Design a protein around this nucleic acid. Structure first.
Lengths: 148, 210, 232
RNA sequence: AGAUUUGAGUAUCGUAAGAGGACUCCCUUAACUUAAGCAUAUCAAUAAGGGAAGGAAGAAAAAAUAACAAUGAUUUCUUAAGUAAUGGCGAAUGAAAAAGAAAAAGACCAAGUUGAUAAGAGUGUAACUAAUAGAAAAGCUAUAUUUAAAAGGGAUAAUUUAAAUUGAAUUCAGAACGAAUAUUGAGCCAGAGAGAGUGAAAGCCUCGUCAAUUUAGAUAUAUCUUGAAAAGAAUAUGGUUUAGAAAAGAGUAAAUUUAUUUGGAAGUAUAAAUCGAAAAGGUGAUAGUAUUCAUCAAAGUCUAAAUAUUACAGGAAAACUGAUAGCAAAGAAGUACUGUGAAGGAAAACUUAAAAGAACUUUGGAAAAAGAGUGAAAAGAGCUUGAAAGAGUAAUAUGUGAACGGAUAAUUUAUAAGAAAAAUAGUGGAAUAUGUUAUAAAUAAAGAUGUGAAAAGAUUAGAUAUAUAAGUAGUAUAUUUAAUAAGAUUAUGUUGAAAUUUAUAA
RNA sequence: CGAGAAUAGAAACUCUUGAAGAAGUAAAUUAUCUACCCGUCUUGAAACACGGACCAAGGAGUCUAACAUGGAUGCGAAUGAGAAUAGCAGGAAAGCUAUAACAUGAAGAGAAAACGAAAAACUAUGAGAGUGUAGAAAUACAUUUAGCAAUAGUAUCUUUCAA
RNA sequence: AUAAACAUACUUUGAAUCGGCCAAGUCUGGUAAGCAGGACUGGCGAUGCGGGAUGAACCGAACGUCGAGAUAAAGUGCCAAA
RNA sequence: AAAAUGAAGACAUUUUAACGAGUAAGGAAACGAAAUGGCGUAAGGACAACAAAAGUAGUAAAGAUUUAAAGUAAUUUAGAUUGAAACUGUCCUUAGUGCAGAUCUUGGUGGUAGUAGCAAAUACUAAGAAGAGGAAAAAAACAUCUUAGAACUGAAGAGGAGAAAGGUUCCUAAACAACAUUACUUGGAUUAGGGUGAAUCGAUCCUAAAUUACAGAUGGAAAUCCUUAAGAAA
RNA sequence: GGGAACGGGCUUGAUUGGAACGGCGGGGAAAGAAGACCCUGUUGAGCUUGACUCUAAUUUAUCAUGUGA
RNA sequence: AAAGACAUUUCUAGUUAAUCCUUUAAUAAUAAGGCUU
RNA sequence: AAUAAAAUAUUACUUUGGAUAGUUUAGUUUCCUGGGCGAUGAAGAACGCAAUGAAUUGCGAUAAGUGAUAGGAACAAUAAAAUGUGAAUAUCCAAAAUUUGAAUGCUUGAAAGUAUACUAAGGUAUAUAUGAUAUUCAAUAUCCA
């Protein structure tokens, strides 16, 4: 909407809100990120202090698929199967059927342990497990299963 | 609506095709309607006009009847021997008439007008009987669903439904608040004007009774 | 630049105006392709099938739990399904000799796909006339096949209570033709998945998943020390 | 003398050239610019120069990715991603696999083998030839599997393209106008109320538009005939008697160096100088050597489809411009005109419905003027309207080295404010108000909890038929027979808020 | 003599002018007071600073792309899926539908290998809700309970040489 | 003691600007300057009005359109109100 | 700013109190007690006589010129004249959206101003003719043609012919709107016709300085070199 | 007089009758030209030079396999 | 020594070997690249 | 002190000028279908042809048009002649198609020209490079009597 721009409220004002002393000239210190080490150094220090330099080792061809590992906390495990299934097997124990939460089927590979688990046995199947994730699962009466 | 992507609904292209039309196409655009007596004789609505025909001017200042003396396809006009103007210095000039302001009252039929009139009459009959085939099929569907009614009802007067069933919807209260100020003022003004018209009518009715 | 902003990285310093591609032909690609699809649906009528494709696993561990349509069945999958590789391309089956047999599970999964397709397949005779040899030979062996099918019915009756054909017969018969556009939409890649439930035992309860992960990691990083020690 | 090789002239039948180059494949080491200077860098496969193509071209069938529960020619789109990486590590530059789609199709040469070898080649045509990747010849055979007389004609049908034909309903009535489509009134058509023309605004005046018809042209579209339905032929795994005891692309792949290029960084690609392989070998992007592993098998060729297009040609649209705008060009526009040349390069739309474009007289040398006349109207051709700047005429007003403006009055001019009506006392109640009744309408319900019906399907177990059938409740389809489990959708109880406010008439 | 308070009373008018033109307003002239050339740069221009003879028409913060803040909106541990693309009716550059790749987010630190968050929290002040009494009109005090947001500080936990 | 709820504390986003000049019961360099440079404050710039005849900065006082009054600086022979 | 009232009244509510200078600059839209309020241009989607003919318009549109009214203002409204066919009001959406300046662009027009000028090339006069075009109180000047007078270039010419360049300007007749700084009956100007005759003059033919081919040589290319050397050519 | 320190305009005075012809060169800091002198731009260009960085031409070394000693 | 479906991890002491991270199919000795100063 | 000639101011009418309004056979952009040239002489250039034409349009010594097939009564500025025994008009057709230009027998400046062969004129063919076939040859290049 060009009728709501500031250009429609500065018609009649000579300089269009750019000043009479310091005009609206072509450049205001260079083009792009020019002068990052000479006259815009105070801007780069203030707002991007680690812009200039090197840090870390180069990876000549990065295989970003190897670092792909979605994670789910223990507190979010039961939401994969829903609260209806969770309440159905609320009084399960050793010996009878216990729901299996296949994280890989839902796109989660590693199970991290954060937050609390409802006090029901559960079988958690995933590729990797955190240390506290296995402790919290076992303390609730469940089991940890490996995949792939 | 037009569903033929080949023809154009652009006014500029329609006028351009009118000015640059060849002589063959200009003949058909210069068409006139047969009179009552000729239409009964041939069952043809209209034909392209021709020299030595007799027409009758039905629109314009002078509704005279005359004989066609020229069919000027460059100007899309015709000339009549009985419609002339004296060009100041004594001599007369024909006055141009559009062929849609006249009706043909007598035909100059040599041999191709006879063939054309026969062809036009036959095509009129075929389309008239084709429409009858469609009309009965549309009538057949109506009867199979409303056996107690006939299709002539669609041409008579219609009796509107008078039942005035209301519905309780929990949005009539909000309606006045769902209008912007410009349309709220118009709606409230119409309510006030409508109410005042009933007030004067009631005053008129009361006086009429007494 | 003034105040707090990101460092701008815009590659417009070249001539982008001649590098601009606009998609004004998008609404008409849909019409052009759909119309070409319909004319493709005729001509090759029936079965404008986009060829039966195998069930293959997506590459890499990021995707390997998913199945997707490959390109062409391997020669072993056709041999296992008892299909001639020369006839396979003519009955709407994709063939790919470039693909190597990856696993037994792949061989069995994609041999079952061909078996299901061959049962759902109806091949019309090469010659429409009723005097064609295949229609003639169908009647000729119809008497003999009745006794041939007698023991096969009881073959699957007692046991279920290498002699295996090199090639199965093509299903060839005269029928009212119904056109399906793609056979990959009839034969699913995988069955729908429901909630899995398992019996909780003390054996699974005591399993130490983290310890096995660390041991697998530590054993992998310990092969370096073995080689250095051996060379010492 | 004769047999060859190589090179010429002539004759015959053909072929290339030039135009165009928007899109396509390439060659060549621009600079302005950015880096707040500048020299690498950037601009940038960019401009200019040069070559070659088609309706598309290019590419295309792994010496390819990957490290997986693995994929699988090429192209194009989405995502990856402004990421990995490159970079006076500054400014800046910058991919690809995986993944999702459109479309899909694989075939040959060389080498090898077969040699009573086949007008033109024996210094070799021709035939066979790959993932069970030691192939290839001739003849018998076993088992599974495929098969109708090919190719070419004729006809019908279907689907499309083009042309032609056809295509409703007021030639309605009144009033008024220079003129009716506008206006008033009564009607009609519509799978047609897109559009144009018509003295002026049209669904029904003309042409058209909707629905259609006919005839031609194609499809590798199906049907029947020619055409018999046989002889045989083909695919694969074997067995056997002879034949045989292979090959797989060289100044290439690499290497040293130089130069350009790349995101490719101890070298991604190209080229040149030198050098130069093979009882094969290439790649896994940190150089080196070793052993494994994985995956391919270069140095010859073709290949539809999905994709691009601001040349040019033919169409259709538009929240685009409306004669200083939109193309430079709404007229004989790349024109007039300029320059030796390469080149440069405009301006200019409108009388009226219809020329009915005054037409005869007087004045004048003529041009013209004044009458007269046409027209609804001079709209009078320098022609729709006709602004401002600048002038002329008429009316009014003022006056000593500026003029104009503002506040306040005076003079003159103009505009401009009205037809009702007294005191007191006899009749006379009329608008309204107070309140009583009756009538009407409106205003209260958001939810909560019960009982059913049920399409489409889904699973399982049976039955019939067809096709196929591995020793894995045989599969698949069509029609039927029962059961479970849910079910989109849908019907209906109970529960739960009134008593007020206006209007109307006495 | 006399405040408060109680008892009772006394105000509804003239004149002049105006459709023969009132009041007001406008225009022109006269008179008193008053008034330097606009735009711009500039400490400062009426400037002996520059542009401006006059009039008409044109004429200058726009479009594409990336990020951020903010006001309105939808949904919300999800949001978008008008990614390509594939279908539908209608003929349609419009509209509707597609258990869906991916983007951003739900987890953060480290150059990287390798990892991956509870003492079901604590402390302070703090929003709100009740009662009683009185002034007395609103309102002002006492007392019971609650402790959100925000800020600051604490234990505990993840990664890092380093929080 | 006094004042202070349209108090106080701010948070985010952003504009313009960083050529300045003047006064003085101030200072430094200079013989000095309507010179150059500073400390504190008030101004002009950005500001018209009443007065100083005239004037960016002096004095009084800061401005919506007006009526009536008391005033400020400063004035009261005429121009010019007294 | 605070109280009060609040489904629609209306003037963007009622009351009370304080306040109002301003360059650069800021205050997008929407927000019932509104987190500023509005005017104008053009186009798009709607709405515009509620009872079945539903904004205005040949009983006069837009535009133009003025006269009055409303508004603080941007502007709006109406009358009259002119003009004759389209247009307007409200809400949203959209922008090629508001000019006094840019030595701004294009076009048109003033003062200067009836002014500076129409002063090199010695020079014209008389009678007659033609023509609308020497009249007149000397309006002292008058273009073309003939005759007479008086003169100039002075034969290295203001003479008679050619080359290049121009291109019909050549000749004749009719005609004078424009053009030749007055005028023109004149013209190299307007209109229409007519006109250029070669065996012997030239071109054509020959070669000069030089120039360009096939084949060849060279170059990434375009193309360059070679002209008788390189050739089964000439 | 003050003012941007040399007014046609402003303040106070001197003074003024409207329209102009021929001259004239005091003024209009008169017209012509975005000062060419001077300075500033992180603006150029011609020319010079062991200014920095390069390059044609020239030069030197190696490689590019004729036979018999 | 204690838990573990018809294998394999944990705790304890002795031993031997390797040991800051990377060069992305796995290792090795050179080489190079990271981190802190 | 005085006059209003010039000057100034407002309105009406007229004029110079061409703004404004209304309008559009012209543009711009997007999309769809093709992308169909040439030694059988292309694109481009020149010249010529209408009863009265200068441009433009169309055409090529058969000239603003010929035949055939459709088509059915006009054209016009003026006059002719023709015309239902077929006027306009349309075309992927047939005939014809000047000089050039890749330009190709040789030459070409603005150049007029000119050779040979086949069939006096007129008309054809004859550039360069190149493939296939035929024919005539050349070189002791290899054998070879």
């Amino acid at each position: 909407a060009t009728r709501f721009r500031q250009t429609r409220r500065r018609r009649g004002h000579v300089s269009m809100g750019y000043g009479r002393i310091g005009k609206h000239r072509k450049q205001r210190g260079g083009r792009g990120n020019a002068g990052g080490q000479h006259h815009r150094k105070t801007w780069f220090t203030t707002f991007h202090p680690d812009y200039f330099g090197k840090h870390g080792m180069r990876v000549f061809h990065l295989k970003a698929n190897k670092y792909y590992c979605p994670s789910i906390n223990v507190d979010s495990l039961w939401s994969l199967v829903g609260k209806d299934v969770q309440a159905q097997y609320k009084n399960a124990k050793v010996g009878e059927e216990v729901p299996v939460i296949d994280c890989v089927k839902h796109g989660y590979f590693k199970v991290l342990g954060k937050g609390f688990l409802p006090k029901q046995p559960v079988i958690v199947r995933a590729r990797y497990f955190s240390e506290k994730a296995q402790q919290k699962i076992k303390a609730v009466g469940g089991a940890c299963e490996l995949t792939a | 609506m037009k569903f033929n992507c080949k023809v154009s609904s652009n006014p500029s292209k329609a006028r351009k095709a009118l000015y640059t039309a060849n002589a063959s196409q200009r003949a058909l655009m210069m068409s006139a309607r047969l009179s009552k007596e000729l239409r009964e004789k041939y069952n043809v609505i209209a034909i392209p006009i021709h020299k030595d025909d007799e027409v009758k001017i039905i629109k314009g200042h002078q509704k005279v009847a005359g004989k066609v003396t020229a069919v000027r396809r460059s100007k899309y006009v015709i000339n009549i021997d009985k419609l002339t103007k004296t060009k100041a210095n004594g001599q007369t000039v024909p006055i141009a008439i559009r062929p849609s302001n006249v009706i043909i009252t007598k035909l100059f039929l040599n041999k191709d007008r006879e063939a054309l009139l026969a062809k036009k009459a036959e095509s009129r009959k075929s389309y008239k009987e084709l429409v009858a085939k469609r009309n009965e099929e549309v009538a057949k569907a109506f009867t199979a669903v409303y056996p107690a009614l006939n299709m002539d009802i669609f041409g008579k007067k219609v009796e509107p439904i008078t039942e005035k069933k209301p519905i309780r919807i929990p949005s009539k209260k909000m309606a006045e608040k769902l209008m912007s100020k410009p349309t709220l003022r118009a709606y409230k003004t119409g309510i006030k004007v409508h109410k005042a018209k009933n007030a004067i009518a009631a005053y008129k009715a009361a006086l009429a009774k007494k | 630049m003034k105040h707090n902003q990101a460092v701008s990285n815009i590659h417009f310093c070249k001539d982008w105006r001649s590098k601009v591609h606009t998609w004004f032909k998008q609404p008409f690609r849909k019409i052009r392709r759909h119309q070409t699809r319909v004319e493709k649906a005729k001509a090759v009528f029936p079965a404008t099938i986009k060829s039966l494709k195998p069930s293959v696993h997506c590459m890499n561990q990021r995707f390997n739990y998913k199945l997707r349509l490959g390109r062409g069945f391997t020669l072993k999958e056709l041999r296992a399904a008892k299909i001639d590789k020369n006839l396979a391309r003519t009955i709407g089956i994709a063939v790919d000799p470039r693909r190597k047999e990856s696993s037994k599970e792949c061989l069995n999964r994609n041999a079952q796909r061909l078996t299901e397709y061959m049962n759902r397949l109806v091949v019309l005779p090469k010659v429409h006339a009723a005097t064609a040899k295949r229609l003639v030979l169908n009647k000729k062996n119809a008497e003999a096949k009745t006794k041939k099918a007698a023991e096969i019915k009881k073959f699957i009756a007692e046991h279920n209570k290498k002699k295996t054909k090199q090639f199965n017969k093509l299903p060839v018969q005269q029928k009212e033709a119904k056109q399906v556009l793609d056979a990959n939409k009839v034969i699913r890649l995988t069955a729908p998945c429901t909630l899995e439930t398992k019996t909780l035992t003390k054996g699974m309860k005591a399993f130490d998943a983290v310890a096995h992960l660390r041991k697998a990691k530590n054993v992998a990083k310990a092969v370096s020390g073995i080689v250095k020690g051996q060379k010492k």
